[PDB]
Design a protein around this ligand. Structure first.
Ligand code: 5RP
Lengths: 208, 208
């Protein structure tokens, strides 16, 4: 079944912790968003790990460089997955993958954040480098779905994000989407917990 | 004259503050580096601003998205310049620019961090969005030097960085480099304050 993921893009610590706590049990994956990490730093990751010793935890660093160092700094905090921006060189991605695998051999992975003009040849390089997650951001239609389908076809576990709603999941019917990332659709609600069960309920209806 | 900038890429706050305090008067620009911000959050910017009321301070966020939030978050902390990764979309770069100018009308600017396969038509797009700084990274030679000249010639103030020794500023002679960014050559020297002087002295012979 497609994972439900919550992205915490709050500009402060309390916002991220409060949303995480109110939706934690309704979701599969918890993501410390980039906006948030740039504000509060990496301790946030260790807090999420303590609150959710079993959840999958994402450190959304959008790493462009010093991959071994950034990957390491977040892995010691308890992160399972870290994002690298697609414009990171292959050596950066491999340095990052190596480090998250050393600290976290259980679950350590890199996910590629897809921004601007990337290519399928680049996509093949990521795969050849041991990296098979990619995150596809909804365009700001069929042009998007085809990109998602092709990335799946190539061997990626594909996460999709960018304005989602409990009612716009059926648009992905028959697609092997690995993870749905909901941010604001949950992190403003309320009964965010219920909003999140809603999302998870729809996924169940459509993929069960 | 070409600026000298130190990149604070430490994985902890004490490392960033110590290096800044010890080399700050030797440099023209102080940069809170991505690795560091991802660790300690944006308060670092505020304490640098407090330590150096007049210096130019860089928040190296390599923002890929939510440009308005990330630029504001760092501008209210006192940042003068903020990096966006070259794969961020134009609207993202515009939102970032508008936020930083809104809070820092005097010195507020965006810098484009060049990673991966960017184009001169992307480059031109940045200029049209009112953004005129780029930061070019040495590759892991003539090919590099030539890219810098072309960027200067389009109307960017180009910053150059990547394993810069002082002994390697000579190969840029007669090139209108706007800023040289030194990280480890300053921050891991055995005389950091001396190393920084070596750098800006060498720059003083060659240019001006
Ligand atoms: O910070 C970086 C990562 O984006 C640059 O590589 C750094 O600014 C250059 O530092 P050094 O002189 O140690 O290569």
């Amino acid at each position: 079944l497609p994972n439900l993921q919550v992205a915490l893009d709050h500009s402060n610590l309390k916002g991220a912790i409060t949303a995480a706590v109110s939706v934690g049990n309704e979701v599969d994956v918890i993501e410390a968003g980039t906006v948030c990490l740039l504000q509060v730093g990496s301790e946030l990751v260790e807090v999420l790990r303590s609150l959710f010793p079993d959840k999958i935890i994402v450190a959304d660093t959008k790493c462009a460089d010093a991959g071994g160092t950034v990957a390491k700094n977040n892995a010691v905090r308890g992160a399972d997955w870290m994002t690298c921006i697609c414009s990171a060189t292959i050596p950066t991605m491999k340095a990052a993958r190596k480090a998250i695998e050393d600290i976290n051999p259980d679950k350590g992975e890199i996910q590629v954040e897809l921004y601007g003009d990337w290519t399928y040849d680049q996509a093949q390089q990521w795969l050849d480098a041991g990296i098979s997650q990619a995150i596809y951001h909804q365009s700001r239609g069929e042009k998007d779905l085809n990109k998602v389908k092709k990335l799946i076809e190539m061997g990626f576990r594909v996460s999709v994000t960018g304005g989602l709603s409990v009612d716009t999941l059926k648009l992905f019917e028959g697609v092997d989407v690995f993870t749905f990332i909901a941010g604001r659709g949950i992190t403003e609600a309320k009964n965010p917990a219920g909003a999140a069960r809603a999302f998870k309920d729809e996924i169940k209806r459509i993929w069960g």
